[model samples]
Target: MDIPWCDLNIKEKIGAGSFGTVHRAEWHGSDVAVKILMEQDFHAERVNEFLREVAIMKRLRHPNIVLFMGAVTQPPNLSIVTEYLSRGSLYRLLHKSGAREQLDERRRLSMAYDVAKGMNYLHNRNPPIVHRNLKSPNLLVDKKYTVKVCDFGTPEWMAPEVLRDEPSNEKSDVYSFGVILWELATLQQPWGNLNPAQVVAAVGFKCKRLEIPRNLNPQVAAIIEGCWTNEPWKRPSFATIMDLLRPLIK
Candidate 1:
């Protein structure tokens, strides 16, 4: 459905990324997030991709995935709207948590399971949606601490095969999920010290992968290892991942 540009009451900017800026907004008296393409970044190709992203999001309906509401396609105000998630992105919860407290094993496992379930939904689709970018920053948390996957741009967490020019597929998302699992395990960004180019070189060309912490649960570590296997075909499907992680969540 096409939402009128005038109907949304823009609030504070909630996020800014390569795709566009996301703002907290009010739509028909309901809270929603409005993702707008900046006038400065306006281009036919970007607009087309934004529309395509909206199309993909509209078809998705799962508890672990953000709910797409509507969109505005007119120039100077092209935007997509979705349900507002108040707790913010998982990146903030994981990395910005003060030294006073940290996420416990159960919480981490729950979040991982949520992501796996969402990916399973996408993969089970007719054509299968490959979330080329699956990272902590793209994952959002609700007031109930429910994790919902969001964002669909960039290749920061893309698989080695994709980095080497191979077309992305379900396995590529699995690789990205492995990185997210590493973040949950260590509470640290994968290659936090390295630049994007360095990460690509180390992970893709050098076959380097995150060092799963010794303190992490063995089952979790095994799942992460399986996801990041060098051979794409060796990576387990999201359905299998959900099964493996189900018994581990407290």
Candidate 2:
């Protein structure tokens, strides 16, 4: 559905960041998220590229991946319309003390299963689609707390290869997934004490990583260790992750 600028009626902001304005909007009488693009980034060449990206996004069909309904192609009001999930992001859930407490280990493992399922679908595509950056903040949830992987990234989960500007592929994405596992297991921000710059030094230059949190299930810990391997090729595929996380969901 290629939507028009005048057709969308934006209500309130559902998201906040430098990316753009994300509003809870009504598009053609349906609740949808409208991620309006900043006009400053709206150039002809980039618009074409965004248009191409939208074509692929529109065809992506999976329950765990957030639905991309349409895009507003008009200048100034260029935006993407997607299905609105009520529960917001996993980051918000984990950071809110009471809410994090409400999530039992089973739920946490199940949500991680959802993430692995979605990424598995993408990574195994005819031409693999690497997420490049993946993390907790971009994972959205519904009423049941079922996870939907969303447009994503933050430095905390960035891979050492990415930080060092090395040629990257699916293994880079795997590295980020390992960090998400850390977040799920710990329920705390990864690299909590380090500044963004320091994270680059420790993770990139020094090849440092977080300590495996105490008391984590040994099975899951081993999977995390495999994914967090310093060398990219050593990281496991999302398929491998699903095999490991699948049984943990119980």
Candidate 3:
């Protein structure tokens, strides 16, 4: 069930998601990760979602955005290929080791800056791309600690009133980004102990917030708070964030 995309054999499974499993594949003497979706898994909505994700990714060409090498349209399994990061995802770094690997201020700030830059690019696009689910688990770090934002999941659907009342534009992206910023700062999942329903409720009520980890890194805490501000327009743009972070990191 393979076409002429590539000749790499799936080596091992790296991760799994709602769609399918991610496998490490070898091609041209280098490594790449493949997200495989089964043929039986294809529904009109699911297929559209996959295609939309592919379209969104194909249009993005930033250093902080994961590279989509190619895709396979095999009968049973359709795989989306991407660059393999050595350090894995920010989620693993935070949760897998139980916070054994604490990212330094410099590194954390650098990641935040990178994420901002990527979002800036996305938000500036023609129709603008709003990353609805901007969580730590979707953020990846390479061997050199370079952060790449991944995962383009759909946002929580709402009616006109809710959509109008709630900000689902670039600012909404900023709010989600703020949550991720808090994750990097505290080295914890966004609302770790809270269930999905509770999280939804808190975010709905604008009560879901972050408490900067003072003992960990105060700088990160401040930055996270700034991003998570209730007023999306009040948050700083990626360009502005770069200006604020450049000298400090240098």
Candidate 4:
């Protein structure tokens, strides 16, 4: 079951991270984003995780979820071929236009609705597919400014043991989606200033929680607070969020 790593003609480097780099490759005269993992970070666990992500993406047919085309497994490198998103991450776009015109409340509410609809489909996955890493970088915008959720890689809080214990349910995914909601409203990282471990500790103990800045308009502040609730069960579901977000977009 070994797949050969084909040497693709790399047009340019599109994206990079601590774990790997994404190359814009010309395959069969079409453009595709190929994510290649570094051999040094290769291990049974990470490989299995990557493979699991591929499996999940392959089965996802939603418009809001990115399409996964193929993979390469040779030379201790793992590569995933996906449709190239030309607009890039929403995070970069939000920061690029300067502070004069922040993502306005109307657009922020629209993004919230788009994310909720996407999450609703994910939450309804027969066994459910929790997008563990729901953050700014994972949210992408197309030419129309429509939002699509990307990166199904496991979330930090999603331990292997937890996966084995619970059904691939919606609750965990809801929590992450809530964080995404906070991002839309605040234009802030979910747990700014805290390390991953510290964030976990604070969320676990309810010692530290999200606080929308006073400068944010009142309506958006209210929505962000609703999502950042400490009690996971108490946070609004995607379905409910969709219903509530309707009037706010106007």
Q: lDDT by residue for model 1 over 1-250, one digit each (tens)?
A: 8998999999999999775799999999999999887765558897788788778778889999998889997777888899999989987888885611656778888889999999999888899877877778889999877899884434457799877777766689899998888787678877877888887788878888888878878999999999999999999999899999998884
Clashes of 2: 0
- Best candidate, TM-score-wise? 2
How much is 192 displaced in model 3, in angstroms? 2.8
lDDT of 1: 0.84
Local accuracy by lDDT, each model:
0.84, 0.84, 0.68, 0.67
lDDT at position 74, candidate 1: 73
Q: How does model 2 score by TM-score?
A: 0.93
Off by over 4 Å in 2: 40-43, 152-154
lDDT, model 4, position 94? 66
TM-score of each prediction: 0.90, 0.93, 0.81, 0.74
How much lDDT does candidate 3 score? 0.68
Model 3's number of clashes is: 0
| Per-residue alpha-carbon lDDT of candidate 3 for residues 86-138, written as tens digits (9 for 90 to 100) | 77887677666645345676677678788888888877789887776666677
How many clashes in each candidate?
0, 0, 0, 0
What C-alpha lDDT, on a 0 to 100 scale, does residue 57 get in candidate 4? Answer: 74
**Which residue pairs collide in model 3, if any?**
none
After superposition, candidate 4 runs with Cα above 4 Å error: 1-7, 40-53, 73-77, 97-102, 152-169, 189-198, 214-219
